[PDB]
Amino acid sequence: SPEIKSKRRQFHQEIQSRNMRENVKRSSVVVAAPTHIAIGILYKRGETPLPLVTFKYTDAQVQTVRKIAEEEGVPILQRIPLARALYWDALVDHYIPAEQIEATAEVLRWLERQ
Amino acid sequence: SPEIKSKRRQFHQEIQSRNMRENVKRSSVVVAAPTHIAIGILYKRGETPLPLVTFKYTDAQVQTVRKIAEEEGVPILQRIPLARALYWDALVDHYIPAEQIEATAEVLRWLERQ
């Protein structure tokens, strides 16, 4: 149900016990809405049968994510609709939602070319 | 700057020292994206020269907001685009952003008719 999904999102967010640098470092790429949202994505073919959302940070935390990503060599992409969609619907430390498969694959095709 | 605005959002969210019932009780109306976002709006002509955002809650917290609102007689409206826009851009305990003046006035015209 949408209500249970909401409970799961909140819970999996709260149970996470990682600091920001650790979360950025363990990601493959960060998708961001500048000054608003940063979402970490882990995908290793694999390793990971699907991409996983590793973190969500918002507002001023995004600047800090950008800084750490540059330090740790993790690429950050501006992908406003994807970042918003993952923010609303993804569970942290779970595979990406079905609805974001196409958009996430597009990001990861980009990452593969780097 | 967008960066300073983001710092202000985060700060004003964190400095707030109100519990959920107190926040709902002191609102005039709650605008919600079901299972995702609840935003409290205070407007009293006035009292308040402009509407103020009193709170932001998300995910499973929204169910709790709905419950408390019913208990406390505070109306809740489904207004998905407005709720999202306020979530991203409004500062809690400040007047609503310029961009949401029209949409918020529409909500408050509705409240005035009740």
Q: Please tell me what DSSP assigns to residue B63.
A: H
The domain made up of A1-114 has a fold known as name from scop (3.40.1690)
- Spell out which chain A residues touch chain B, with contact meaning CB-CB distance below 8 angstroms: 2-3, 5-7, 9-11, 13, 34-36, 58-63, 88
Partners of B88 on chain A (C-beta within 8 Å) are 36
Strands annotated E in chain A: 29-33, 37-42, 52-58, 76-78
Radius of gyration of chain A (CA): 13
**A91 φ/ψ sector (left φ>0, alpha ψ -120 to 50, else beta):** beta
**In whole angstroms, what is the distance from residue B38 CA to residue B78 CA?**
9
Q: Are A86 and A100 in contact (CB under 8 A)?
A: yes
Of the candidates A3, A7, A36, the beta carbon closest to that of B88 is on A36
Kindly report the nearest CA distance between residue A60 and chain B, in angstroms.
5
Residue B77, phi then psi, degrees to nearest 5: -120, 140
Task: Spell out the residues 6+ positions from residue B87 whose beta carbon is closer than 8 angstroms to its own.
Answer: B37, B39, B56, B58
**In whole angstroms, what is the distance from residue B83 CA to residue A112 CA?**
36
Q: Are B72 and B66 in contact (CB under 8 A)?
A: no
Q: Are A41 and A50 in contact (CB under 8 A)?
A: no
Write out the DSSP string of B2-17: HHHHHHHHHHHHHH--
Of the candidates B6, B13, B61, the beta carbon closest to that of A35 is on B6
> Does B9 contact A60 at a Cβ distance shorter than 8 Å?
yes
> What tokens does A4 get?
């249970």
Q: Are B82 and B56 in contact (CB under 8 A)?
A: no
The kind and range of the H/E element at A81 are: helix A80-89
- Asked whether the bond before A46 is cis by omega within 30 degrees of 0, the reply is yes
**In whole angstroms, what is the distance from residue B20 CA to residue B30 CA?**
12
Q: Please tell me what DSSP assigns to residue B90.
A: P
Structure determination method = X-ray
Of the candidates A9, A10, A60, the beta carbon closest to that of B10 is on A60
Boundaries of every domain in chain B: 1-114
Residue B29, phi then psi, degrees to nearest 5: -160, 155
